[PDB]
Amino acid sequence: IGTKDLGIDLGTANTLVYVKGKGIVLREPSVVAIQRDTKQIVAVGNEAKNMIGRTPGNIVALRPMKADYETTATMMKYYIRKAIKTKGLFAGKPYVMVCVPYGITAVEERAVIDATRQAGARDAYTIEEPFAAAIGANLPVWEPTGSMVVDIGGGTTEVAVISLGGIVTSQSIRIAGDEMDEAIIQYIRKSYNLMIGERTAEAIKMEIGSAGNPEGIGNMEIRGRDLLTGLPKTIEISAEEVAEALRDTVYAIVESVKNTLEKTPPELAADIMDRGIVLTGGGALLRNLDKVISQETDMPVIVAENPLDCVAIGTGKALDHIDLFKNKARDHR
């Protein structure tokens, strides 16, 4: 009982490790450096970032979280080892709670667990990302009343209705932050014959992006490739245009919220109408998305406190409930 148990959120962009009794102790990019020819991972996280910055050549920089067995095991080994400052004398390895995407299958869950134990966990358990998000957002997930979370990440939006320590109904769509970026890229290509890159698209979304009602958000000067001449060009784009670019993405997200509500038992949907829907993840920060989802569902919608950290916090808080997740894993044997 001397080694502190761990919760790990291996996110698409950032990895966060929660240590029982200590909180978030590790905040590192979900990045790996591999040897360009032998495809071997030579650094992880901040160490990969530092090595990339020293440009030693013969290295390739990768974001492997969108994982295969050996990459998970290698990344887990690094993060577990780095987060644990001291070991127990009689049991030097932690129990580890691993955040996994919604809809993970049984065989996949056993593979994640195996990779985590290979990485040095005494034993390992999994928790679905929207359930971790609801726990970390402080929703009353253990009570017999309905709670709703909408976790908008990079590659997926997950919607879940929670009650009594479990997901009652849920939906996941592959429409999130990455797809907002792509919609912006495609709108600018079609409207201005201009090809922008990923950095500029993300910057546009962050600086003047919104889900609707973009009054006073402002305009931005952007640079990219004139598709006629192939030379770089600068134009000014408006928050109004960006809002129109993001419309189909936003309403796909709204549709997934509605579709989940439609599959939801009436009394749980009634509870949510009363307490409100909570948005988590980086995509929850899209200006006015809460207002748009609220307007389209006639339900209260709030952005969670600490929306970027909710999943990792909930993965750590799940350590006070290991019996539940123990039982969940034995279901998926």
Author numbering: 4 to 69, 74 to 340
Original authors' sentences:
The crystals belong to the monoclinic P21 space group and contain one molecule of MreBGs per asymmetric unit. Subdomain IA (blue) of MreBGs is formed by residues 1–32, 66–145 and 315–347; subdomain IB (yellow) by residues 33–65; IIA (red) by residues 146–181 and 246–314 and IIB (green) by residues 182–245. Loop β6-α2, which connects subdomains IA and IB and closes the nucleotide-binding pocket, is partially disordered in apo MreBGs. In domain IA, the hydrophobic loop α2-β7, which has been shown to be involved in MreBTm membrane binding and is 2 residues longer in MreBGs, displays a distinct conformation, packed on the N-terminal extremity of the polypeptide chain. Crystal packing analysis revealed straight protofilaments characterized by a subunit repeat distance of 51 Å, similar to that observed in crystal structures of other actin homologs. However, because of the open conformation of MreBGs, domain IB interacts with domain IA and not with domain IIA as observed for example for MreBTm. We noticed that in the crystal structure of the apo form of MreBGs this short hydrophobic N-terminal sequence is in close proximity to loop α2-β7, which in MreBTm carries the hydrophobic residues L93 and F94 involved in membrane binding.
The current model is that self-aligned MreB filaments restrict the diffusion of CW biosynthetic proteins in the membrane and orient their motion to insert new peptidoglycan strands in radial hoops perpendicular to the long axis of the cell, promoting the cylindrical expansion of rod-shaped cells. We successfully purified a soluble form of MreB from the Gram-positive thermophilic Geobacillus stearothermophilus (MreBGs) and elucidated its crystal structure, confirming the classical actin/MreB fold and the presence of the small hydrophobic loop shown to mediate membrane binding in MreBTm and MreB5Sc. We also show that the interaction with lipids is mediated by electrostatic interactions and by two spatially close hydrophobic motifs in the MreBGs monomers that comprise the small hydrophobic loop and the N-terminal end.
